[PDB]
Amino acid sequence: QLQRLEKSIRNNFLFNKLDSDSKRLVINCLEEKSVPKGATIIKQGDQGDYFYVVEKGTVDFYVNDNKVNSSGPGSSFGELALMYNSPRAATVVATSDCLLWALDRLTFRKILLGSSFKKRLMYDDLLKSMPVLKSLTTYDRAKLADALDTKIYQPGETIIREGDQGENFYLIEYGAVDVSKKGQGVINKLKDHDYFGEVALLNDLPRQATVTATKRTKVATLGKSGFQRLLGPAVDVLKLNDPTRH
Ligand SMILES: Nc1ncnc2c1ncn2[C@@H]1O[C@@H]2COP(=O)(O)O[C@H]2[C@H]1O
Ligand SMILES: Nc1ncnc2c1ncn2[C@@H]1O[C@@H]2COP(=O)(O)O[C@H]2[C@H]1O
C-alpha cells in the first residue's frame, strides 16, 4: 500500500525531515524486501548496494563475529557504505522474519546524504585525515561527525584561555595556532590536523594554556559529553599524549 509507506516516512528521523519533493521522490523509489529469520541481509566487507528501513522484524549486528548491536521496527541501517564508498562495517543477521524498505545507492546519494547525513559528508575529509583518529571505523567516524560544529577563527583571536572551565575539544581543519602559558610565552604551536583542548576534559581541570589563532583557522568542536563517548579508539592516545604528564 501507500499508507504503510507514508507511515514508514513519518516515523523515520531521516525521512519525516525531507521536503515533499525529496519525500515524494523517495516513496516512489522504496522497494520492499521480505526476509526469513536467519538470513544475512548484509555481510561485513561487502560493497554497499542499498539502504534499509525496518517496517517489521528485528536484526542483530556483528562486527568481526562478536555482536555489538540490535534493532527493531523503525530502525534503519546500511547507510555508511553508501555515503563513504567503503566496505560494509558490520554483518546484519535477521533475528525474526522482517519486511525492509530499500533505497538503492543512487537515490540515497540523491535525497538522503544530501540532507539527513549532511554533517557526515562535510567532515569526512578532516576525520579520515586526522592522525589521532586513525583507529576509528566508519561507524565511529559517522557518529563523531554528527556531533561536531564548525567555527572559524581569525588572526589574533583567542580560542581558549588558560584558567577557564573547559567544554569543547577541538580538531584543526586548517589554520595555525599558538599555545601559551602566562610566565612562559608560546610553548607549542599546532596546525592542520592537530587537536587541542583534551586536557581539561580528560582530567576535569581548568584549561592549562591559552590557544590563539595566528592564521585564519577552521576547527571542528566536540562537547564534553560527546568527547566522553564518540572518541573511544582515539581516547587512549589522547591520555598517552596528555601534557599533564612526563
Ligand atoms: N557497531 C557497528 N559497527 C559498524 N556498523 C554498524 C554497527 N552497528 C550498526 N551498524 C550498521 O550496520 C550496517 C552495516 O553496513 P554499513 O557499513 O553500510 O552500515 C552499517 C550501519 O548502518
Ligand atoms: N605543553 C602543553 N601544555 C598545556 N597544554 C597544551 C600543551 N601543548 C598543547 N596544549 C593544548 O593546549 C590546550 C589548552 O586547553 P586544555 O588544557 O584543555 O588542553 C591543552 C592542550 O590540548
PDB file of C-alpha atoms and ligand atoms in Angstrom:
ATOM      1  CA  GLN A   1       0.000   0.000   0.000  1.00  0.00           C
ATOM      2  CA  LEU A   2       0.860   3.725   0.022  1.00  0.00           C
ATOM      3  CA  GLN A   3      -0.246   4.088   3.681  1.00  0.00           C
ATOM      4  CA  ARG A   4       2.475   1.730   5.001  1.00  0.00           C
ATOM      5  CA  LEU A   5       4.976   3.946   3.148  1.00  0.00           C
ATOM      6  CA  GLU A   6       3.676   7.313   4.305  1.00  0.00           C
ATOM      7  CA  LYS A   7       3.919   5.826   7.826  1.00  0.00           C
ATOM      8  CA  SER A   8       7.466   4.462   7.219  1.00  0.00           C
ATOM      9  CA  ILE A   9       8.450   8.071   6.446  1.00  0.00           C
ATOM     10  CA  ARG A  10       6.518   9.854   9.145  1.00  0.00           C
ATOM     11  CA  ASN A  11       8.264   7.695  11.739  1.00  0.00           C
ATOM     12  CA  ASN A  12      11.785   7.811  10.393  1.00  0.00           C
ATOM     13  CA  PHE A  13      14.043  10.639  11.570  1.00  0.00           C
ATOM     14  CA  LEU A  14      15.844  10.751   8.180  1.00  0.00           C
ATOM     15  CA  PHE A  15      12.642  10.940   6.118  1.00  0.00           C
ATOM     16  CA  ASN A  16       9.977  12.887   8.093  1.00  0.00           C
ATOM     17  CA  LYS A  17      12.561  15.632   7.709  1.00  0.00           C
ATOM     18  CA  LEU A  18      12.864  15.836   3.893  1.00  0.00           C
ATOM     19  CA  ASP A  19      10.849  18.327   1.720  1.00  0.00           C
ATOM     20  CA  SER A  20       7.825  16.730  -0.001  1.00  0.00           C
ATOM     21  CA  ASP A  21       9.925  16.877  -3.243  1.00  0.00           C
ATOM     22  CA  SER A  22      12.613  14.614  -1.777  1.00  0.00           C
ATOM     23  CA  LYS A  23       9.741  12.976   0.183  1.00  0.00           C
ATOM     24  CA  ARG A  24       7.669  12.249  -2.963  1.00  0.00           C
ATOM     25  CA  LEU A  25      10.937  11.390  -4.721  1.00  0.00           C
ATOM     26  CA  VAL A  26      11.536   8.570  -2.108  1.00  0.00           C
ATOM     27  CA  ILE A  27       8.134   6.850  -1.594  1.00  0.00           C
ATOM     28  CA  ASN A  28       8.290   6.465  -5.419  1.00  0.00           C
ATOM     29  CA  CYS A  29      11.653   4.616  -5.050  1.00  0.00           C
ATOM     30  CA  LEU A  30      11.366   2.366  -1.951  1.00  0.00           C
ATOM     31  CA  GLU A  31      11.369  -1.321  -2.916  1.00  0.00           C
ATOM     32  CA  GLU A  32      10.155  -3.744  -0.246  1.00  0.00           C
ATOM     33  CA  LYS A  33      12.006  -6.974   0.640  1.00  0.00           C
ATOM     34  CA  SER A  34      10.830  -9.756   2.986  1.00  0.00           C
ATOM     35  CA  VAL A  35      13.447 -11.830   4.817  1.00  0.00           C
ATOM     36  CA  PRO A  36      13.311 -15.050   6.851  1.00  0.00           C
ATOM     37  CA  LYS A  37      14.619 -15.316  10.428  1.00  0.00           C
ATOM     38  CA  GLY A  38      18.287 -16.415   9.968  1.00  0.00           C
ATOM     39  CA  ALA A  39      19.070 -14.695   6.661  1.00  0.00           C
ATOM     40  CA  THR A  40      22.119 -12.403   6.493  1.00  0.00           C
ATOM     41  CA  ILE A  41      20.883  -9.049   4.997  1.00  0.00           C
ATOM     42  CA  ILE A  42      24.362  -7.508   4.604  1.00  0.00           C
ATOM     43  CA  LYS A  43      27.862  -9.044   5.056  1.00  0.00           C
ATOM     44  CA  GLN A  44      30.843  -7.278   6.658  1.00  0.00           C
ATOM     45  CA  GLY A  45      33.360  -6.368   3.941  1.00  0.00           C
ATOM     46  CA  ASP A  46      30.885  -6.361   1.012  1.00  0.00           C
ATOM     47  CA  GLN A  47      30.327  -3.467  -1.383  1.00  0.00           C
ATOM     48  CA  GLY A  48      27.352  -1.282  -0.439  1.00  0.00           C
ATOM     49  CA  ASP A  49      24.308  -1.683  -2.664  1.00  0.00           C
ATOM     50  CA  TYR A  50      21.266  -0.469  -0.616  1.00  0.00           C
ATOM     51  CA  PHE A  51      19.937   1.414   2.382  1.00  0.00           C
ATOM     52  CA  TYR A  52      17.321  -0.379   4.576  1.00  0.00           C
ATOM     53  CA  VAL A  53      14.494   0.807   6.861  1.00  0.00           C
ATOM     54  CA  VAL A  54      12.777  -1.850   9.024  1.00  0.00           C
ATOM     55  CA  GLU A  55       8.965  -1.991   8.783  1.00  0.00           C
ATOM     56  CA  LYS A  56       8.530  -5.203  10.730  1.00  0.00           C
ATOM     57  CA  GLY A  57      11.015  -7.636  12.333  1.00  0.00           C
ATOM     58  CA  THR A  58      14.319  -7.374  14.296  1.00  0.00           C
ATOM     59  CA  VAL A  59      18.121  -7.503  13.287  1.00  0.00           C
ATOM     60  CA  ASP A  60      21.458  -8.338  15.121  1.00  0.00           C
ATOM     61  CA  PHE A  61      24.711  -6.600  14.197  1.00  0.00           C
ATOM     62  CA  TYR A  62      28.059  -8.359  14.225  1.00  0.00           C
ATOM     63  CA  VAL A  63      31.472  -6.747  13.899  1.00  0.00           C
ATOM     64  CA  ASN A  64      34.077  -9.476  13.268  1.00  0.00           C
ATOM     65  CA  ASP A  65      31.645 -12.114  14.569  1.00  0.00           C
ATOM     66  CA  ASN A  66      31.260 -10.565  18.052  1.00  0.00           C
ATOM     67  CA  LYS A  67      27.827  -8.894  18.071  1.00  0.00           C
ATOM     68  CA  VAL A  68      27.531  -5.327  19.060  1.00  0.00           C
ATOM     69  CA  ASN A  69      24.025  -4.026  18.303  1.00  0.00           C
ATOM     70  CA  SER A  70      20.329  -4.825  17.881  1.00  0.00           C
ATOM     71  CA  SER A  71      17.329  -3.041  16.361  1.00  0.00           C
ATOM     72  CA  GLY A  72      13.560  -3.401  15.745  1.00  0.00           C
ATOM     73  CA  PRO A  73      10.890  -1.663  13.551  1.00  0.00           C
ATOM     74  CA  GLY A  74      11.604   1.958  12.820  1.00  0.00           C
ATOM     75  CA  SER A  75      15.344   1.410  12.761  1.00  0.00           C
ATOM     76  CA  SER A  76      17.473   1.846   9.594  1.00  0.00           C
ATOM     77  CA  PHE A  77      20.931   0.557   8.568  1.00  0.00           C
ATOM     78  CA  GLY A  78      23.294   0.162   5.582  1.00  0.00           C
ATOM     79  CA  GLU A  79      23.923   3.935   5.249  1.00  0.00           C
ATOM     80  CA  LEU A  80      27.724   4.057   5.964  1.00  0.00           C
ATOM     81  CA  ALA A  81      28.854   2.033   2.914  1.00  0.00           C
ATOM     82  CA  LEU A  82      26.918   4.292   0.556  1.00  0.00           C
ATOM     83  CA  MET A  83      27.837   7.706   1.922  1.00  0.00           C
ATOM     84  CA  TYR A  84      31.542   6.905   2.237  1.00  0.00           C
ATOM     85  CA  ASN A  85      32.144   4.311  -0.529  1.00  0.00           C
ATOM     86  CA  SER A  86      33.729   1.945   1.971  1.00  0.00           C
ATOM     87  CA  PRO A  87      33.145  -1.756   2.654  1.00  0.00           C
ATOM     88  CA  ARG A  88      30.263  -2.925   4.878  1.00  0.00           C
ATOM     89  CA  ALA A  89      31.229  -2.181   8.524  1.00  0.00           C
ATOM     90  CA  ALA A  90      29.036  -4.859  10.138  1.00  0.00           C
ATOM     91  CA  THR A  91      27.156  -8.003   9.334  1.00  0.00           C
ATOM     92  CA  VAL A  92      23.373  -7.659   9.811  1.00  0.00           C
ATOM     93  CA  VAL A  93      21.593 -11.023  10.559  1.00  0.00           C
ATOM     94  CA  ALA A  94      17.723 -11.314  10.585  1.00  0.00           C
ATOM     95  CA  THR A  95      16.531 -12.130  14.119  1.00  0.00           C
ATOM     96  CA  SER A  96      12.889 -12.702  13.332  1.00  0.00           C
ATOM     97  CA  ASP A  97      11.363 -12.608   9.870  1.00  0.00           C
ATOM     98  CA  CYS A  98      11.388  -8.939   8.528  1.00  0.00           C
ATOM     99  CA  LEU A  99       9.912  -6.527   5.965  1.00  0.00           C
ATOM    100  CA  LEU A 100      12.539  -3.960   4.858  1.00  0.00           C
ATOM    101  CA  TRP A 101      12.066  -0.847   2.666  1.00  0.00           C
ATOM    102  CA  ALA A 102      15.094  -0.420   0.358  1.00  0.00           C
ATOM    103  CA  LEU A 103      16.707   2.634  -1.129  1.00  0.00           C
ATOM    104  CA  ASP A 104      19.189   1.931  -3.860  1.00  0.00           C
ATOM    105  CA  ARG A 105      22.578   3.606  -3.660  1.00  0.00           C
ATOM    106  CA  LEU A 106      21.635   6.172  -6.352  1.00  0.00           C
ATOM    107  CA  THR A 107      18.522   7.617  -4.650  1.00  0.00           C
ATOM    108  CA  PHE A 108      20.237   7.566  -1.241  1.00  0.00           C
ATOM    109  CA  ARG A 109      23.012   9.834  -2.713  1.00  0.00           C
ATOM    110  CA  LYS A 110      20.255  11.827  -4.365  1.00  0.00           C
ATOM    111  CA  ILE A 111      17.879  12.573  -1.445  1.00  0.00           C
ATOM    112  CA  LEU A 112      19.264  11.353   1.907  1.00  0.00           C
ATOM    113  CA  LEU A 113      23.069  12.044   2.052  1.00  0.00           C
ATOM    114  CA  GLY A 114      22.197  15.466   0.555  1.00  0.00           C
ATOM    115  CA  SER A 115      20.160  16.251   3.700  1.00  0.00           C
ATOM    116  CA  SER A 116      19.965  13.788   6.605  1.00  0.00           C
ATOM    117  CA  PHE A 117      23.648  12.991   6.916  1.00  0.00           C
ATOM    118  CA  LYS A 118      24.897  16.385   5.650  1.00  0.00           C
ATOM    119  CA  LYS A 119      27.407  16.611   8.514  1.00  0.00           C
ATOM    120  CA  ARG A 120      28.885  13.214   7.782  1.00  0.00           C
ATOM    121  CA  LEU A 121      29.559  14.293   4.250  1.00  0.00           C
ATOM    122  CA  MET A 122      31.237  17.573   5.219  1.00  0.00           C
ATOM    123  CA  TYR A 123      33.663  16.363   7.908  1.00  0.00           C
ATOM    124  CA  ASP A 124      34.641  13.212   6.197  1.00  0.00           C
ATOM    125  CA  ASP A 125      37.991  14.520   4.941  1.00  0.00           C
ATOM    126  CA  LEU A 126      39.012  16.012   8.329  1.00  0.00           C
ATOM    127  CA  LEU A 127      38.172  12.815  10.222  1.00  0.00           C
ATOM    128  CA  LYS A 128      39.799  10.374   7.736  1.00  0.00           C
ATOM    129  CA  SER A 129      42.972  12.560   7.665  1.00  0.00           C
ATOM    130  CA  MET A 130      43.465  13.293  11.415  1.00  0.00           C
ATOM    131  CA  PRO A 131      46.286  11.070  12.846  1.00  0.00           C
ATOM    132  CA  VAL A 132      44.760  10.652  16.337  1.00  0.00           C
ATOM    133  CA  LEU A 133      41.568   9.387  14.640  1.00  0.00           C
ATOM    134  CA  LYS A 134      43.159   6.546  12.584  1.00  0.00           C
ATOM    135  CA  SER A 135      41.760   3.614  14.628  1.00  0.00           C
ATOM    136  CA  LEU A 136      38.091   4.805  14.077  1.00  0.00           C
ATOM    137  CA  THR A 137      35.826   2.718  11.875  1.00  0.00           C
ATOM    138  CA  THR A 138      33.364   4.336   9.549  1.00  0.00           C
ATOM    139  CA  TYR A 139      30.579   3.772  12.051  1.00  0.00           C
ATOM    140  CA  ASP A 140      32.641   5.675  14.606  1.00  0.00           C
ATOM    141  CA  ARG A 141      33.601   8.485  12.235  1.00  0.00           C
ATOM    142  CA  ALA A 142      29.893   8.861  11.395  1.00  0.00           C
ATOM    143  CA  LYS A 143      28.716   9.180  14.936  1.00  0.00           C
ATOM    144  CA  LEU A 144      31.551  11.632  15.638  1.00  0.00           C
ATOM    145  CA  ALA A 145      30.687  13.811  12.596  1.00  0.00           C
ATOM    146  CA  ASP A 146      27.001  14.134  13.666  1.00  0.00           C
ATOM    147  CA  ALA A 147      28.224  15.707  16.900  1.00  0.00           C
ATOM    148  CA  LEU A 148      30.676  18.344  15.529  1.00  0.00           C
ATOM    149  CA  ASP A 149      30.088  22.021  14.992  1.00  0.00           C
ATOM    150  CA  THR A 150      32.297  24.291  12.910  1.00  0.00           C
ATOM    151  CA  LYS A 151      33.847  27.597  13.980  1.00  0.00           C
ATOM    152  CA  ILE A 152      36.290  29.875  12.076  1.00  0.00           C
ATOM    153  CA  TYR A 153      38.732  31.940  13.993  1.00  0.00           C
ATOM    154  CA  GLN A 154      40.671  34.865  12.554  1.00  0.00           C
ATOM    155  CA  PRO A 155      44.240  36.009  13.116  1.00  0.00           C
ATOM    156  CA  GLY A 156      44.902  37.106  16.754  1.00  0.00           C
ATOM    157  CA  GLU A 157      41.659  35.636  18.103  1.00  0.00           C
ATOM    158  CA  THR A 158      41.683  33.691  21.422  1.00  0.00           C
ATOM    159  CA  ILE A 159      40.202  30.279  21.149  1.00  0.00           C
ATOM    160  CA  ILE A 160      40.730  29.227  24.745  1.00  0.00           C
ATOM    161  CA  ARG A 161      42.124  30.873  27.823  1.00  0.00           C
ATOM    162  CA  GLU A 162      44.318  29.361  30.479  1.00  0.00           C
ATOM    163  CA  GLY A 163      42.404  29.012  33.718  1.00  0.00           C
ATOM    164  CA  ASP A 164      38.942  28.704  32.159  1.00  0.00           C
ATOM    165  CA  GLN A 165      36.497  25.888  32.541  1.00  0.00           C
ATOM    166  CA  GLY A 166      36.704  23.615  29.500  1.00  0.00           C
ATOM    167  CA  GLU A 167      33.770  22.359  27.495  1.00  0.00           C
ATOM    168  CA  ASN A 168      34.897  21.690  23.946  1.00  0.00           C
ATOM    169  CA  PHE A 169      37.567  19.629  22.304  1.00  0.00           C
ATOM    170  CA  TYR A 170      38.987  20.926  19.010  1.00  0.00           C
ATOM    171  CA  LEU A 171      40.217  19.429  15.762  1.00  0.00           C
ATOM    172  CA  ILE A 172      42.059  21.765  13.412  1.00  0.00           C
ATOM    173  CA  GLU A 173      40.811  21.540   9.820  1.00  0.00           C
ATOM    174  CA  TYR A 174      43.360  24.144   8.543  1.00  0.00           C
ATOM    175  CA  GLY A 175      44.945  27.176  10.153  1.00  0.00           C
ATOM    176  CA  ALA A 176      47.659  27.696  12.669  1.00  0.00           C
ATOM    177  CA  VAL A 177      47.520  28.365  16.420  1.00  0.00           C
ATOM    178  CA  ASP A 178      49.929  29.213  19.253  1.00  0.00           C
ATOM    179  CA  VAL A 179      49.757  27.591  22.745  1.00  0.00           C
ATOM    180  CA  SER A 180      50.927  29.864  25.576  1.00  0.00           C
ATOM    181  CA  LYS A 181      51.250  29.962  29.326  1.00  0.00           C
ATOM    182  CA  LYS A 182      51.454  33.018  31.486  1.00  0.00           C
ATOM    183  CA  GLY A 183      55.024  33.429  32.612  1.00  0.00           C
ATOM    184  CA  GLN A 184      56.279  31.316  29.705  1.00  0.00           C
ATOM    185  CA  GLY A 185      55.016  32.742  26.380  1.00  0.00           C
ATOM    186  CA  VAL A 186      54.486  30.444  23.372  1.00  0.00           C
ATOM    187  CA  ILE A 187      55.329  26.833  24.382  1.00  0.00           C
ATOM    188  CA  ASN A 188      53.890  24.983  21.339  1.00  0.00           C
ATOM    189  CA  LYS A 189      52.160  25.507  18.003  1.00  0.00           C
ATOM    190  CA  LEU A 190      49.586  23.471  16.106  1.00  0.00           C
ATOM    191  CA  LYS A 191      48.225  23.403  12.624  1.00  0.00           C
ATOM    192  CA  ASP A 192      46.249  21.331  10.228  1.00  0.00           C
ATOM    193  CA  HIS A 193      45.244  18.004  11.803  1.00  0.00           C
ATOM    194  CA  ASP A 194      46.338  18.778  15.336  1.00  0.00           C
ATOM    195  CA  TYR A 195      43.695  18.810  18.077  1.00  0.00           C
ATOM    196  CA  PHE A 196      43.768  20.640  21.372  1.00  0.00           C
ATOM    197  CA  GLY A 197      41.603  21.037  24.412  1.00  0.00           C
ATOM    198  CA  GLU A 198      41.575  17.459  25.737  1.00  0.00           C
ATOM    199  CA  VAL A 199      43.477  18.101  28.968  1.00  0.00           C
ATOM    200  CA  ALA A 200      40.595  19.933  30.710  1.00  0.00           C
ATOM    201  CA  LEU A 201      38.050  17.329  29.640  1.00  0.00           C
ATOM    202  CA  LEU A 202      40.197  14.170  30.377  1.00  0.00           C
ATOM    203  CA  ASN A 203      41.217  15.364  33.836  1.00  0.00           C
ATOM    204  CA  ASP A 204      38.419  17.747  34.937  1.00  0.00           C
ATOM    205  CA  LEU A 205      40.807  20.608  35.178  1.00  0.00           C
ATOM    206  CA  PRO A 206      40.696  24.197  34.060  1.00  0.00           C
ATOM    207  CA  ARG A 207      42.345  24.932  30.734  1.00  0.00           C
ATOM    208  CA  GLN A 208      46.125  24.586  31.188  1.00  0.00           C
ATOM    209  CA  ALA A 209      47.137  27.016  28.485  1.00  0.00           C
ATOM    210  CA  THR A 210      45.834  29.860  26.132  1.00  0.00           C
ATOM    211  CA  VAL A 211      45.368  28.935  22.403  1.00  0.00           C
ATOM    212  CA  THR A 212      45.291  31.871  19.858  1.00  0.00           C
ATOM    213  CA  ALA A 213      44.806  31.678  16.081  1.00  0.00           C
ATOM    214  CA  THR A 214      47.783  33.145  14.128  1.00  0.00           C
ATOM    215  CA  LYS A 215      46.130  32.488  10.795  1.00  0.00           C
ATOM    216  CA  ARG A 216      42.578  32.040   9.642  1.00  0.00           C
ATOM    217  CA  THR A 217      41.703  28.739  11.404  1.00  0.00           C
ATOM    218  CA  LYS A 218      38.735  26.440  10.888  1.00  0.00           C
ATOM    219  CA  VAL A 219      38.120  23.942  13.680  1.00  0.00           C
ATOM    220  CA  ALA A 220      35.598  21.259  14.302  1.00  0.00           C
ATOM    221  CA  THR A 221      34.456  21.304  18.015  1.00  0.00           C
ATOM    222  CA  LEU A 222      33.013  18.453  20.071  1.00  0.00           C
ATOM    223  CA  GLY A 223      31.321  18.975  23.517  1.00  0.00           C
ATOM    224  CA  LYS A 224      32.367  17.091  26.701  1.00  0.00           C
ATOM    225  CA  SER A 225      29.587  14.551  26.620  1.00  0.00           C
ATOM    226  CA  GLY A 226      30.455  13.782  23.015  1.00  0.00           C
ATOM    227  CA  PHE A 227      34.220  13.672  23.898  1.00  0.00           C
ATOM    228  CA  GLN A 228      33.385  11.094  26.525  1.00  0.00           C
ATOM    229  CA  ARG A 229      31.602   8.787  24.061  1.00  0.00           C
ATOM    230  CA  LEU A 230      32.391   9.379  20.463  1.00  0.00           C
ATOM    231  CA  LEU A 231      36.277   9.014  20.566  1.00  0.00           C
ATOM    232  CA  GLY A 232      36.590   5.509  22.030  1.00  0.00           C
ATOM    233  CA  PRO A 233      39.549   4.229  19.962  1.00  0.00           C
ATOM    234  CA  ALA A 234      41.378   7.650  19.941  1.00  0.00           C
ATOM    235  CA  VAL A 235      40.962   8.217  23.686  1.00  0.00           C
ATOM    236  CA  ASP A 236      43.958   6.130  24.822  1.00  0.00           C
ATOM    237  CA  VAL A 237      46.222   8.184  22.511  1.00  0.00           C
ATOM    238  CA  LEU A 238      44.908  11.341  23.920  1.00  0.00           C
ATOM    239  CA  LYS A 239      45.734  10.145  27.528  1.00  0.00           C
ATOM    240  CA  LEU A 240      49.102   8.916  26.329  1.00  0.00           C
ATOM    241  CA  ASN A 241      49.866  12.329  24.663  1.00  0.00           C
ATOM    242  CA  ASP A 242      48.478  14.265  27.650  1.00  0.00           C
ATOM    243  CA  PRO A 243      50.909  17.067  28.514  1.00  0.00           C
ATOM    244  CA  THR A 244      49.791  16.913  32.189  1.00  0.00           C
ATOM    245  CA  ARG A 245      52.317  14.006  32.178  1.00  0.00           C
ATOM    246  CA  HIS A 246      56.063  13.319  31.666  1.00  0.00           C
TER     247      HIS A 246
HETATM  248  N1  LIG B   1      28.825  -1.381  15.861  1.00  0.00           N
HETATM  249  C1  LIG B   1      28.677  -1.175  14.498  1.00  0.00           C
HETATM  250  N2  LIG B   1      29.744  -1.077  13.593  1.00  0.00           N
HETATM  251  C2  LIG B   1      29.541  -0.878  12.234  1.00  0.00           C
HETATM  252  N3  LIG B   1      28.291  -0.759  11.673  1.00  0.00           N
HETATM  253  C3  LIG B   1      27.140  -0.873  12.437  1.00  0.00           C
HETATM  254  C4  LIG B   1      27.305  -1.068  13.925  1.00  0.00           C
HETATM  255  N4  LIG B   1      26.072  -1.112  14.435  1.00  0.00           N
HETATM  256  C5  LIG B   1      25.191  -0.938  13.391  1.00  0.00           C
HETATM  257  N5  LIG B   1      25.788  -0.756  12.211  1.00  0.00           N
HETATM  258  C6  LIG B   1      25.022  -0.577  10.914  1.00  0.00           C
HETATM  259  O1  LIG B   1      25.224  -1.791  10.165  1.00  0.00           O
HETATM  260  C7  LIG B   1      25.477  -1.503   8.791  1.00  0.00           C
HETATM  261  C8  LIG B   1      26.364  -2.497   8.036  1.00  0.00           C
HETATM  262  O2  LIG B   1      26.530  -1.925   6.736  1.00  0.00           O
HETATM  263  P1  LIG B   1      27.048  -0.387   6.521  1.00  0.00           P
HETATM  264  O3  LIG B   1      28.521  -0.212   6.917  1.00  0.00           O
HETATM  265  O4  LIG B   1      26.720   0.173   5.183  1.00  0.00           O
HETATM  266  O5  LIG B   1      26.155   0.412   7.585  1.00  0.00           O
HETATM  267  C9  LIG B   1      26.187  -0.179   8.885  1.00  0.00           C
HETATM  268  C10 LIG B   1      25.423   0.539   9.959  1.00  0.00           C
HETATM  269  O6  LIG B   1      24.323   1.185   9.284  1.00  0.00           O
HETATM  270  N1  LIG B   2      52.658  21.787  26.566  1.00  0.00           N
HETATM  271  C1  LIG B   2      51.277  21.992  26.766  1.00  0.00           C
HETATM  272  N2  LIG B   2      50.676  22.318  27.976  1.00  0.00           N
HETATM  273  C2  LIG B   2      49.392  22.593  28.087  1.00  0.00           C
HETATM  274  N3  LIG B   2      48.547  22.486  27.005  1.00  0.00           N
HETATM  275  C3  LIG B   2      48.964  22.186  25.779  1.00  0.00           C
HETATM  276  C4  LIG B   2      50.401  21.941  25.586  1.00  0.00           C
HETATM  277  N4  LIG B   2      50.567  21.638  24.294  1.00  0.00           N
HETATM  278  C5  LIG B   2      49.378  21.678  23.662  1.00  0.00           C
HETATM  279  N5  LIG B   2      48.419  22.050  24.582  1.00  0.00           N
HETATM  280  C6  LIG B   2      46.979  22.170  24.323  1.00  0.00           C
HETATM  281  O1  LIG B   2      46.507  23.453  24.828  1.00  0.00           O
HETATM  282  C7  LIG B   2      45.253  23.108  25.445  1.00  0.00           C
HETATM  283  C8  LIG B   2      44.643  24.211  26.288  1.00  0.00           C
HETATM  284  O2  LIG B   2      43.469  23.691  26.928  1.00  0.00           O
HETATM  285  P1  LIG B   2      43.462  22.272  27.578  1.00  0.00           P
HETATM  286  O3  LIG B   2      44.273  22.294  28.836  1.00  0.00           O
HETATM  287  O4  LIG B   2      42.023  21.802  27.726  1.00  0.00           O
HETATM  288  O5  LIG B   2      44.225  21.267  26.581  1.00  0.00           O
HETATM  289  C9  LIG B   2      45.529  21.770  26.221  1.00  0.00           C
HETATM  290  C10 LIG B   2      46.267  21.031  25.099  1.00  0.00           C
HETATM  291  O6  LIG B   2      45.316  20.380  24.248  1.00  0.00           O
END
